[PDB]
Design an enzyme around this catalytic site. Structure first.
Site, PDB file in Angstrom:
ATOM      1  N   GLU A 123      46.622  12.478 -84.327  1.00  0.00           N
ATOM      2  CA  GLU A 123      47.007  11.526 -85.502  1.00  0.00           C
ATOM      3  C   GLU A 123      48.836  11.197 -85.275  1.00  0.00           C
ATOM      4  O   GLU A 123      49.652  12.609 -86.134  1.00  0.00           O
ATOM      5  CB  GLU A 123      46.848  11.765 -86.657  1.00  0.00           C
ATOM      6  CG  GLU A 123      46.634  10.447 -88.071  1.00  0.00           C
ATOM      7  CD  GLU A 123      46.698  11.245 -89.372  1.00  0.00           C
ATOM      8  OE1 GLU A 123      45.559  11.971 -89.413  1.00  0.00           O
ATOM      9  OE2 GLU A 123      46.790  11.034 -90.313  1.00  0.00           O
ATOM     10  N   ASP A 169      51.479   9.397 -88.155  1.00  0.00           N
ATOM     11  CA  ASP A 169      51.677   8.076 -88.856  1.00  0.00           C
ATOM     12  C   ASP A 169      52.942   7.351 -89.018  1.00  0.00           C
ATOM     13  O   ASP A 169      54.235   7.412 -89.112  1.00  0.00           O
ATOM     14  CB  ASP A 169      51.126   9.033 -89.759  1.00  0.00           C
ATOM     15  CG  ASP A 169      49.722   9.817 -90.270  1.00  0.00           C
ATOM     16  OD1 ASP A 169      48.798   8.876 -90.359  1.00  0.00           O
ATOM     17  OD2 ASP A 169      50.366  10.650 -90.408  1.00  0.00           O
ATOM     18  N   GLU A 181      53.671   6.130 -94.229  1.00  0.00           N
ATOM     19  CA  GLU A 181      52.677   6.111 -95.466  1.00  0.00           C
ATOM     20  C   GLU A 181      53.529   6.133 -96.145  1.00  0.00           C
ATOM     21  O   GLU A 181      54.032   6.428 -96.630  1.00  0.00           O
ATOM     22  CB  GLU A 181      51.484   6.980 -95.309  1.00  0.00           C
ATOM     23  CG  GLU A 181      50.659   7.795 -94.672  1.00  0.00           C
ATOM     24  CD  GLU A 181      50.129   8.713 -94.132  1.00  0.00           C
ATOM     25  OE1 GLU A 181      50.488   9.991 -93.421  1.00  0.00           O
ATOM     26  OE2 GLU A 181      48.883   9.545 -94.904  1.00  0.00           O
TER      27      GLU A 181
END
Ligand SMILES: [Cl-]
Ligand SMILES: [Cl-]
Ligand SMILES: [Cl-]
Ligand SMILES: [Cl-]
Ligand SMILES: [Cl-]
Ligand SMILES: [Cl-]
Ligand SMILES: [Cl-]
Length: 271
Positions: free
Chosen positions: A137, A139, A142
């Protein structure tokens, strides 16, 4: 011919149509607007709207129930009451290496929600060899999930086999390899800003309005990942334990609905 901002003189990049959208229309062929549920909210197709060139992902105060995984007790709970629904746009196509960028405006409400631009793979528990990566994952960003509104996260999450055991690695537990914290030089809720990441087999570099805000070695992020835009719920409406969110007692409707807006998402692969 549209080229990425990190393109150096003499280079050629190719836009990946299946993971790029200027959001003039809501394209359900390209995006899954109601993916599998997790966290303490549920995705609803109606929470994803496209109007005047932007994708709007809305979090609404909306009571409902659904089966909920209670990790702390290692049990699935039927008819579990939840209090908010939100929006998501997950690309059906997958990929890994390339430059990704989204022009995003955060939700006005804070604290309570976290606009996110990220990508994640399916979890393959059949990969049990030492060093095997079962989940990747990345990111890209965020937003608004920390104490101060201008603190942004550009993290990594993964599951890798260590000593024969599938091990979870998160930014909080393994910051050196999985966390890039950044103090934004602006309020992310004001106007649109660009959030990008360049992924290669060796490095992952994060950008915010052209500035490099993070860099990590690509140790566990080579799996096929679906590009995603979504808005999650956060404190004061959540608690975090046993590696997952749980609802808090604060289910206020004040500040809702609130939405993040995405002017566009562009993905390129270098030639
Ligand atoms: Cl608008
Ligand atoms: Cl986490
Ligand atoms: Cl996290
Ligand atoms: Cl606007
Ligand atoms: Cl380097
Ligand atoms: Cl370096
Ligand atoms: Cl808003």
């Amino acid at each position: 011919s549209m080229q990425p901002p990190i393109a150096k003189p003499g280079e050629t990049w190719i836009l990946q149509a299946k993971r790029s959208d200027e959001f003039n229309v809501k394209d359900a062929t390209k995006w899954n607007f109601q993916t599998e549920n997790y966290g303490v909210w549920s995705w609803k197709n109606e929470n994803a709207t496209v109007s005047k060139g932007k994708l709007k992902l809305t979090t609404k105060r909306e009571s409902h129930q659904r089966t909920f995984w209670d990790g702390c007790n290692q049990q699935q709970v039927a008819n579990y009451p939840l209090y908010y629904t939100s929006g998501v746009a997950k690309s059906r196509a997958t990929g890994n290496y390339g430059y990704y960028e989204a022009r995003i405006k955060g939700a006005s409400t804070f604290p309570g929600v976290s606009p996110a631009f990220w990508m994640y793979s399916t979890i393959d528990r059949s990969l049990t060899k030492e060093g095997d990566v079962q989940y990747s994952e990345i990111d890209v960003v965020e937003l608004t999930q920390k104490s101060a509104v201008r603190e942004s996260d550009h993290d990594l999450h993964n599951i890798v086999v260590k000593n024969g055991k599938p091990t979870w690695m998160r930014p909080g537990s393994f910051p050196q390899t999985n966390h890039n914290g950044y103090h934004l030089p602006f309020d992310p809720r004001n106007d649109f800003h660009t959030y990008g990441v360049n992924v290669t087999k060796d490095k992952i570099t994060w950008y915010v309005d052209g500035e490099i805000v993070g860099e990590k070695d690509n140790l566990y992020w080579h799996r096929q990942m679906n590009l995603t835009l979504s808005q999650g719920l956060r404190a004061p409406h959540t608690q975090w334990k046993c590696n997952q969110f749980y609802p808090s007692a604060n289910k206020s409707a004040e500040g809702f609905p609130t939405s993040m807006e995405v002017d566009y998402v562009r993905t390129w692969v270098k030639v």
